Nucleic acid binder design. Structure first.
Ligand SMILES: *P(=O)(O)OC[C@H]1O[C@@](C#N)(c2ccc3c(N)ncnn23)[C@H](O)[C@@H]1O
Ligand SMILES: [Mg+2]
Ligand SMILES: [Mg+2]
Ligand SMILES: [Zn+2]
Ligand SMILES: [Zn+2]
Lengths: 834, 114, 63
RNA sequence: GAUUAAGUUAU
RNA sequence: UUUAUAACUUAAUC
C-alpha cells in the first residue's frame, strides 16, 4: 500500500507516495509519545498529501479519513460536486470538523519538542511520523547530545502543514473562553485594536520552535521576504480576533478649533498595526492637500452615517450613508433591425446553420449589484506554505528582470483619459480632469511624499457594467478614488510602461495582434520545446477568490524596482497604502459602506500586471509541486534527479536565497515549460515526455494547486490540450487560431467566434449608434475583427465577413489601401509590414 | 476658478457632516480609550442614533425584527418605519407568512436607539 | 423561428422598460426572468410559451 | 508626425 | 451613474 512520506536522504528528496533505539527511554514519559513494546491507519502526512494533491475520482483516502473521524458519512459523496467549494460551499463545514485533531496535533508536537529539548535529542520532525491522534512514534534518526540542549528541526513539518491550518480552521477553539469549544465565545472590548500580545501568545503556544523571528507588526520587518513571512502568520492569528477591530483607526482632531474625526492609522489582518507619522492634533487652517486627504478618508463618512444591518449579504456592513437603499437595474440592449433584415436577406439564421446568435445584453433587476458583490464570500483566509512561496517569489521575480522601474515626478505622468470618474466622494463634484488641473505639480508631489509616511484609506465605488455576453451574470466594475490613482500612477507607471513596451517576453500585455503580431507571439511561445504540446487553463472566480497573500506578493514583486529611490519605510507605507486602498478597502455599493474581504479591484492601476504576476506564481507553484511529488528513484535522468534534490534542499533546508539555483530552475522552466501570459489568460508549450513522467506540471497539478492554495475547483471541462502545433492554441483572449497561407508562407491568424461579431452587429447599448456616421465606423471595426473568417474552411463562417462588407457598401451608398469598402484594406491589417 | 469652487465644495461637505458628529456619545467612546484611538468599525455601531435593516425574506424577518422592538449590537431598537423595495410604506400587520408573497422584497426597516 | 423569438423578446423588454415597468420591482423581476429564459432557451416551444407569457404583461396595461 | 475627440476589441 | 490597462480604426490641428 502506498503512503505519503517526507523524504530527504543523500539519495532522494521530496514529498511523495512510496510503497511500504534506546532513546525511547529518554522520551517515554512524554504524553505525546506512542507506546512501544495504539496507532491509526493514516498519519498526518496522509491528510496533508490528500488535501495538497486533490484529484476527484482518485480520492478514496480522503473519503476514508472523512468518514473514519465522523466529519461526514459515506452517503455524503453521492451528492454531485460534494468537493467543490463553489457548487457545494457546505464542504467547508465538513473539513472544519478536522480542526480539533490538527490543533491537538500541534499541541502534542510542541510537547514533543519540549521533551526533545530537555532530553538533549537532535532530530528532524516529519509529518509521516505523527498519527492522526497526534502521537509521535519514530525516533530512529535522532542523535544524543547534552541534555537540556536539544534542537528540534521543524521547518518542513510546519511549512507543509500550514495550508491545512486555515482550511480546517484549526484555531477556532481560541475564540472560546479557556480554548474549550463547549464554553462560550470570548467577549472582547470593542475599543481594543492592538492584539499584539495575543498574537505573540498564539505564536508561542503553537509555533514555539519555529526558528525565524516573527513580527506581529510588519512595520518592524527587515525586507519584503520578512514581510511575507510575518504576514503569513498574521493571516492565521487574525481569524481569532473580532472583525470589528480591523480597518482604519480614528482619532479626534481640531481644525479652527472645530473637532474632526480623522484616520491616524490602520489595523491590518496581514500587516498588523500601522500608525501615521504626520499627525498634528491642532491646526489653524486646512490646505487643499489636507482637504483632499480628509475627503478621501472614510472616517468622516462612516462616523456621520447610520448603522446598517444588511441581511442580503454575508459581508460585514459598516454604515448606511443615505436614508434609502438603491436598487439600480440593468437595461436590455437595443436592436438593430436594419442590420438583421439585411442578414436574413443574405441567408443567415436559417435552421441547421452552424452560425447562430448567442451573445446578448442580459437585463438585471434591482438585486443585481448586491447579489454580485456577495461573491466575495469565495474569498477565504488562506495560509501559504511559506518556504515554498519564498522560493517561488525569487523564481517569479526572474520573469520581471528585463523591465525598468522606479518613482517618477508628477510632471511626467501620462494620464490617458481625464474625462472619467474620480470616485467617491470626488465624483460628486467633478471628473479626474478637475483634480489634475486644480493641483499643481508641487501639490501632487507633496501628496505622493505624504503617502510614503502615512496611510490614506479610501472608498471604492462599485457600478454595474452594460456589456454584451453569452452569460446571464451581471458584471460590476470597481471605481477607485482619484487620491489613490494619482499616487499609484506616480509609483508604478514607469514599470507598467516598460512592460507594455517590451516584445518577445513572457508577459504579452501591450503587444498588438495586428500586422503579424499574433504569429510572432505564437512563435515566441513555441520557442524551442522539443516534445511540444499546448495547454490552457481557467481560473474560476479569479477576481473574488484570490488569497490576500498572493496579492501582497504581487505588490511586492512590482515594488522590487524601487531600491534606489525609496527607503524601506517608504516602501512599507507604499505597500500599506496599496493594501488599504485596493485589498481590504471599504466598498460603496448602493449608498451603503461594506468591507471587502479581499481579492483584486478592477479599477486598480496595476490590476492586469498583478494578475499576470499571480498567474506566473501559480504556474511556478504547479511545476514545483509536480517535481517534488514524483518518485525520485524512478527519475531516469541524472540531471533532473539532482535538480529535484537541490530544489527540495533550497525550499526546506536553506533560508538564504540560492541565486544560482534560482537561475538554473528559471532556465529549466524556460526550456521546458515556456509560457505566454496576459493577465489571467495563459498558453503553455511544454515538453510532453517530461509532463508524462511528472517532470513538469500538467492540468492535474494545476487542479491540486488551485484546490489547496486558491480555494477553487478547476474542472477539466474548461481546460484544453492540443497535441499538434500546426493547430494553434485552442483558446486565447477569446480568439481561435488557424494556419493560413498568406503570400509565400503560412502564418497564424486569430479569429473570433462568429456569434460574437453578429451579436455586436445586431445589438447596441445606445440608440445613437444607429446613426449612419457612427454605425459605419462601428462596422469597419467589426469587419477588421471579422476578416480572418474568410480563410476558414466553413463557408458559413466565411460569409460573416462578406455580410459586413456588403452592409458597409450599403451604408456608404446611403451616405486604394485606405478605402475601407474593399477587401484589400482589411487584408493589409494582418500582414507584417505595418 | 474651479480650484476655489472645489475647495469650497469639499470644505462645505466636511463642515456639513459635523451636524451629527461631536455628539457626547462620540466623546464618551473616545475619551476612555487608553490612547484616544479607536477602530472605525465600532463608531456607528456604538454611537449611531438610527439603524437600517434590509431583510430579503420573511424567514430572516422573524429571526431579526419580530415585534415593534428588537435587540441588536447590545442595544434595544424601536421600529419607526418599514418600506419595501419600491419605497412604499408597509405596515407591521401586513408582514405575515400568508401575505408575504404579495409584498415586494427586500424590506427596509428603520429603527431608533432606545 | 428561434432567432426571431429572441429578437422580438429583446425589443419587447425594451418597450416595457421605456413604459416605466421597472419602477415596479415585483413585475420587473419576472420580466427579466422571462427575457433571460427566452434568450437562454435552445428549443422554440419553451421560447414561444415564455414569449407569450411576457407579451401578456404588455397586453395587460394600456400599451 | 506629436497632442485632442469618437468608436471597436480584449483583459 | 458607468473603473483600469492595451491594441486598432476614424476625424481633426500645428
Ligand atoms: P477575463 O478572463 O475576461 O477576466 C479576468 C480578469 O480580467 C480583469 C482585468 N484586468 C477584467 C476583465 C474585464 C474587465 C473590465 N471590463 N474592467 C476591468 N478589469 N477587467 C479582472 O481583473 C478579472 O479578474
Ligand atoms: Mg476567468
Ligand atoms: Mg478570456
Ligand atoms: Zn517581519
Ligand atoms: Zn520607488
Amino acid at each position: 500500500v502506498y503512503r505519503a512520506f517526507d523524504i530527504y536522504n543523500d539519495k532522494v528528496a521530496g514529498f511523495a507516495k512510496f510503497l511500504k533505539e534506546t532513546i525511547y527511554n529518554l522520551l517515554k514519559d512524554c504524553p505525546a509519545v506512542a507506546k512501544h513494546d495504539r496507532l491509526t491507519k493514516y498519519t498526518m502526512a496522509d491528510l496533508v498529501y490528500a488535501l495538497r494533491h486533490f484529484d476527484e475520482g482518485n480520492c478514496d483516502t480522503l473519503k476514508e479519513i472523512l468518514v473514519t473521524y465522523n466529519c461526514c458519512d459515506d452517503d455524503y459523496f453521492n451528492k454531485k460536486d460534494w468537493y467543490d467549494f463553489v457548487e457545494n460551499p457546505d464542504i467547508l463545514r465538513v473539513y472544519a470538523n478536522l480542526g480539533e485533531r490538527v490543533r491537538q496535533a500541534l499541541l502534542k508536537t510542541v510537547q514533543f519538542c519540549d521533551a526533545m529539548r530537555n532530553a538533549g535529542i537532535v532530530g528532524v520532525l516529519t509529518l509521516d511520523n505523527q498519527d492522526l491522534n497526534g502521537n509521535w512514534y519514530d525516533f530512529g534518526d535522532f542523535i544524543q547530545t547534552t541534555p537540556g540542549s536539544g534542537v528540534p528541526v521543524v521547518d518542513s513539518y510546519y511549512s507543509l502543514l500550514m495550508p491545512i491550518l486555515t482550511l480546517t480552521r484549526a484555531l477556532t477553539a481560541e475564540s472560546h473562553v479557556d480554548t474549550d469549544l463547549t464554553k462560550p465565545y470570548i467577549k472582547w472590548d470593542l475599543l481594543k485594536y492592538d492584539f499584539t500580545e495575543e498574537r505573540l501568545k498564539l505564536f508561542d503556544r503553537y509555533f514555539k520552535y519555529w526558528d525565524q523571528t516573527y513580527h506581529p507588526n510588519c512595520v518592524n520587518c527587515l525586507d519584503d521576504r520578512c514581510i511575507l513571512h510575518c504576514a503569513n502568520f498574521n493571516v492565521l492569528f487574525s481569524t481569532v480576533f473580532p472583525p470589528t477591530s480591523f480597518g482604519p483607526l480614528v482619532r479626534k482632531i481640531f481644525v479652527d478649533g472645530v473637532p474632526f474625526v480623522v484616520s491616524t492609522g490602520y489595523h491590518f489582518r496581514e500587516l498588523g498595526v500601522v500608525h501615521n507619522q504626520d499627525v498634528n492634533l491642532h491646526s489653524s487652517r486646512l490646505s487643499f492637500k489636507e482637504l483632499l486627504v480628509y475627503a478621501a478618508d472614510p472616517a468622516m463618512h462612516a462616523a456621520s452615517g447610520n448603522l446598517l444591518l444588511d441581511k442580503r449579504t454575508t459581508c460585514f456592513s459598516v454604515a448606511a450613508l443615505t436614508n434609502n437603499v438603491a436598487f439600480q437595474t440593468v437595461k436590455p440592449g437595443n436592436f438593430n433591425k436594419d442590420f438583421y433584415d439585411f442578414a436574413v436577406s443574405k441567408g443567415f439564421f436559417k435552421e441547421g446553420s452552424s452560425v447562430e446568435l448567442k451573445h446578448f445584453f442580459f437585463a438585471q433587476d434591482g438585486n443585481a449589484a448586491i447579489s454580485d458583490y456577495d461573491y466575495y464570500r469565495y474569498n477565504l483566509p488562506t495560509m501559504c506554505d511559506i518556504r515554498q512561496l519564498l522560493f517561488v517569489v525569487e523564481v517569479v521575480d526572474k520573469y520581471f528582470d528585463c523591465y525598468d522601474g522606479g518613482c517618477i515626478n508628477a510632471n511626467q505622468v501620462i494620464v490617458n483619459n481625464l474625462d472619467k470618474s474620480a470616485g467617491f466622494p470626488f465624483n460628486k463634484w467633478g471628473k479626474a480632469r478637475l483634480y489634475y488641473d486644480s493641483m499643481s505639480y508641487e501639490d501632487q508631489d507633496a501628496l505622493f511624499a505624504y503617502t510614503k509616511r502615512n496611510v490614506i484609506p479610501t472608498i471604492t465605488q462599485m457600478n454595474l457594467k452594460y456589456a454584451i455576453s453569452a452569460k446571464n451574470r451581471a458584471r460590476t466594475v470597481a471605481g477607485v478614488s482619484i487620491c489613490s490613482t494619482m499616487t499609484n500612477r506616480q509609483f508604478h507607471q514607469k514599470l507598467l510602461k516598460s512592460i507594455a513596451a517590451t516584445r518577445g517576453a513572457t508577459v504579452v500585455i501591450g503587444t498588438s495582434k495586428f500586422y503579424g503580431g499574433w504569429h510572432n507571439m505564437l512563435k515566441t511561445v513555441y520557442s524551442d520545446v522539443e516534445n511540444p504540446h499546448l495547454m490552457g487553463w481557467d481560473y474560476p472566480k479569479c477576481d473574488r477568490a484570490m488569497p490576500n497573500m498572493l496579492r501582497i506578493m504581487a505588490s511586492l514583486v512590482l515594488a522590487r524596482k524601487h531600491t534606489t529611490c525609496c527607503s524601506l519605510s517608504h516602501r512599507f507605507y507604499r505597500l500599506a497604502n496599496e493594501c488599504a486602498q485596493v485589498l481590504s478597502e471599504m466598498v460603496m455599493c448602493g449608498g451603503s459602506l461594506y468591507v471587502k474581504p479581499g481579492g483584486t479591484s478592477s479599477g486598480d492601476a496595476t490590476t492586469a500586471y498583478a494578475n499576470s504576476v499571480f498567474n506566473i506564481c501559480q504556474a511556478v507553484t504547479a511545476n514545483v509541486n509536480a517535481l517534488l511529488s514524483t518518485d525520485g528513484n524512478k527519475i531516469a535522468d541524472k540531471y533532473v534527479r539532482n535538480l529535484q534534490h537541490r530544489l527540495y534542499e533550497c525550499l526546506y533546508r536553506n533560508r538564504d536565497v540560492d541565486t544560482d539555483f534560482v537561475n538554473e530552475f528559471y532556465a529549466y522552466l524556460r526550456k521546458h515549460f515556456s509560457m505566454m501570459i496576459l493577465s489571467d489568460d495563459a498558453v503553455v508549450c511544454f515538453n510532453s515526455t517530461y509532463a508524462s513522467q511528472g517532470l513538469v506540471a500538467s492540468i492535474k497539478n494545476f487542479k491540486s494547486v488551485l484546490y489547496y492554495q486558491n480555494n477553487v475547483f478547476m474542472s477539466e471541462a474548461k481546460c484544453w490540450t492540443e497535441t499538434d502545433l500546426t493547430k494553434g492554441p485552442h483558446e486565447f483572449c477569446s480568439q481561435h487560431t488557424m494556419l493560413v497561407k498568406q503570400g509565400d508562407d503560412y502564418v497564424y491568424l486569430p479569429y473570433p467566434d462568429p456569434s460574437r461579431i453578429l451579436g455586436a452587429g445586431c445589438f447596441v447599448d445606445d440608440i445613437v449608434k444607429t446613426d449612419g456616421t457612427l454605425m459605419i465606423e462601428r462596422f469597419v471595426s467589426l469587419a477588421i475583427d471579422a476578416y480572418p473568417l474568410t480563410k476558414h474552411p466553413n463557408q458559413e463562417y466565411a460569409d460573416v465577413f462578406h455580410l459586413y462588407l456588403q452592409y458597409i457598401r450599403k451604408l456608404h451608398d446611403e451616405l486604394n489601401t485606405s478605402r475601407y469598402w474593399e477587401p484589400e484594406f482589411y487584408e493589409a491589417m494582418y500582414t507584417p509590414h505595418t | 476658478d474651479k480650484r476655489a469652487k472645489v475647495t469650497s465644495a469639499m470644505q462645505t461637505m466636511l463642515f456639513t457632516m459635523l451636524r451629527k458628529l461631536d455628539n457626547d456619545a462620540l466623546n464618551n467612546i473616545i475619551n476612555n480609550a487608553r490612547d484616544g484611538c479607536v477602530p472605525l468599525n465600532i463608531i456607528p455601531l456604538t454611537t449611531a442614533a438610527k439603524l437600517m435593516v434590509v431583510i430579503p425574506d420573511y424567514n430572516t424577518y422573524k429571526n431579526t425584527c419580530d415585534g415593534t422592538t428588537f435587540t441588536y449590537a447590545s442595544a434595544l431598537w424601536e421600529i419607526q418605519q418599514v418600506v419595501d423595495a419600491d419605497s412604499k410604506i408597509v405596515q407591521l400587520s401586513e408582514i405575515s407568512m400568508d401575505n408575504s408573497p404579495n409584498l415586494a422584497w427586500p424590506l427596509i426597516v428603520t429603527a431608533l436607539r432606545a | 423561428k428561434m432567432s426571431d423569438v429572441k429578437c422580438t423578446s429583446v425589443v419587447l423588454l425594451s418597450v416595457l422598460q421605456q413604459l416605466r415597468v421597472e419602477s415596479s420591482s415585483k413585475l420587473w423581476a419576472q420580466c427579466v426572468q422571462l427575457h433571460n429564459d427566452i434568450l437562454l432557451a435552445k428549443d422554440t416551444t419553451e421560447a414561444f410559451e415564455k414569449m407569450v407569457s411576457l407579451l401578456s404583461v404588455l397586453l395587460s396595461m394600456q400599451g
